[PDB]
From a paper:
In this study, we provided new structural and functional insights into a previously unappreciated mechanism by which Spindlin1 in complex with C11orf84 recognizes K4me3 and K9me3 dual marks on the same histone H3 tail. This unique bivalent histone recognition results in dissociation of HP1 from condensed rDNA chromatin to relax the chromatin structure and facilitate the recruitment of RNA Polymerase I, leading to productive transcription of rRNA. Spindlin1 Tudor 3 domain is responsible for the binding to C11orf84 while the other two Tudor domains act in concert to recognize a non-canonical bivalent histone mark H3K4me3K9me3. Binding to C11orf84 not only stabilizes Spindlin1 but also facilitates its association with H3K4me3K9me3.
The electron density map of C11orf84 amino-acid sequence T255-Q283 is clearly defined and adopts a unique stem–loop conformation. This segment inserts into the cleft between the strand β1 and β4 of Spindlin1 Tudor 3 to form a closed β barrel-like structure. In addition, the binding to C11orf84 appears to stabilize Spindlin1 structure as the N-terminal A204-D211 region including an α helix of Tudor 3 domain is well-defined but was invisible in the previous determined Spindlin1 structures. The H3K4me3K9me3 peptide fits snugly on the surface of Tudor 1 and 2 of Spindlin1. Simultaneous recognition of K4me3 and K9me3 appears to be facilitated by the distance adjustment through the short α-helix formation of the H3 fragments consisting of residues 4–7. This is distinct from the extended conformation of H3 peptide observed in Spindlin1/H3K4me3 and Spindlin1/H3K4me3R8me2a structures. Trimethylated K4 is inserted into the aromatic pocket formed by F141, W151, Y170, and Y177 of Tudor 2 domain whereas trimethylated K9 is recognized by an aromatic cage formed by residues W62, W72, Y91 and Y98 of Tudor 1, and F251 of Tudor 3 domain. In addition to cation-π and methyl-π interactions induced by dual methylated lysine recognition, the N-terminal amino group of H3A1 forms a hydrogen bond with the side-chain carboxylate group of D189, while the guanidino moiety of H3R2 is ion-paired with the side-chain carboxylate group of D184.
Numbering used by the authors:
A (entry chain E): 255 to 283
B (entry chain B): 254 to 283
C (entry chain F), D (entry chain C): 1 to 11
E (entry chain D): 51 to 196, 203 to 262
F (entry chain A): 51 to 195, 204 to 262
Write the structure that this text describes.
Amino acid sequence: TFAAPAEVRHFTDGSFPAGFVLQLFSHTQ
Amino acid sequence: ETFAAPAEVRHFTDGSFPAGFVLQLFSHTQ
Amino acid sequence: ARTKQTARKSG
Amino acid sequence: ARTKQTARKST
Amino acid sequence: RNIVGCRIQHGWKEGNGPVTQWKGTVLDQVPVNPSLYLIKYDGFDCVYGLELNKDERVSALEVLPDRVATSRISDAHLADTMIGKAVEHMFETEDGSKDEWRGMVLARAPVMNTWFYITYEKDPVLYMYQLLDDYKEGDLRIMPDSEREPGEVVDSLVGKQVEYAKEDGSKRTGMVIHQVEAKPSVYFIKFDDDFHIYVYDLVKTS
Amino acid sequence: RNIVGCRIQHGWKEGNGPVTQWKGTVLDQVPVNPSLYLIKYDGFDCVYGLELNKDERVSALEVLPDRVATSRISDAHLADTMIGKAVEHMFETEDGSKDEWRGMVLARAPVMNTWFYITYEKDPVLYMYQLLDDYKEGDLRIMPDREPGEVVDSLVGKQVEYAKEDGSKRTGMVIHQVEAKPSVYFIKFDDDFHIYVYDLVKTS
Ligand SMILES: [Cl-]
Ligand SMILES: [Cl-]
Ligand SMILES: [Cl-]
């Protein structure tokens, strides 16, 4: 059963911005 | 024979162009 | 109030 | 002081 | 034919089950992947992302003649007020108990003018509801907010292909399909392996 | 392959002439027709609408490694003040005298952050210029100021039809409604690569 990642921090072209992370809206705070 | 945009547009292919209006090119006589 | 029963299709 | 010579490509 | 803003009907096959018939409304054609459509299915509140002309589970797709309903928004200022805000959205359970879900109102939905895009801290996928009705019934609390925004500083993420590793270590992919106008650090991702739209916050870590 | 916000180079063949290379900046991908891109070509101020992957005149399309320049807006309030206003925009002619063109500033351009979308009463196509520079140089006058575009069901995405004097039917698409001026619309005609600006006018 698909599970979305809590964090996304990579793009296939290696350009994900330094100093940031994408957090799923359910991520701990 | 250079393209010339129509001064007015008042039809849609689906027949839904709104009654009581016209689209006028910004150069339309004013 | 609304219910979550309509949130997603069953499958 | 812009000119229209840069408005559109030549063709 | 452009199918955005149309009502559609198609067959669906879940696993090795029977072909089932579904009706819905096509909300959007994603610019960064024009094979991908966003659909609201009749009777269900989740937004589905499907490559309607490529997905092997979709058959017998037809455009229905019936027009999408257009009702006047009852309180336009209220609609504008809730966009981008944190909310507490009240639902009820089978024993009649009240079950508050924390979330955020993201935007007016396209095509279906009285519906709003919303997501939830404990269910981080895209939903749509006629929230002015919930609000007038007392079932929606709008919370106040608490240029240097992460989504304003970084180069555009929209149309980037994301990569992530499963627990088993294999690579999976997806696409950043949208940046929220009202909340520029909030993004929608559509994963190649699923038909929900997931909502992510761009957070500064250093 | 998302090319919005990229610099690009491609060949172009005009009529039966040589293939010529052109460089430009991809500003936008039109939501109602994602095959249609809006491009600013280097050196030229007109916005071009091209279906870059479908147009038989386009060859050898490549994304350039160079990043689009960003500068901070010099006067952010002035940028906001100009949007949706009528203007008199001064251009100089070959004898050095200035010719005022009446027009309207429509919006901030996407991608190219100091550029503004503008059109003209006597040339009703989409242009873009760094109008804060014109303003500071003394070459831009900003004029002072139920809407049809609020009354009608959305026109954006509709396919237009018209016939010329010779009676053939031609088509195009309503690609945009101006946020600042909701009775102003952009049309891209299937037979041309400019973006045309139209007013929605009540006639009855
Ligand atoms: Cl890394
Ligand atoms: Cl949005
Ligand atoms: Cl606009």
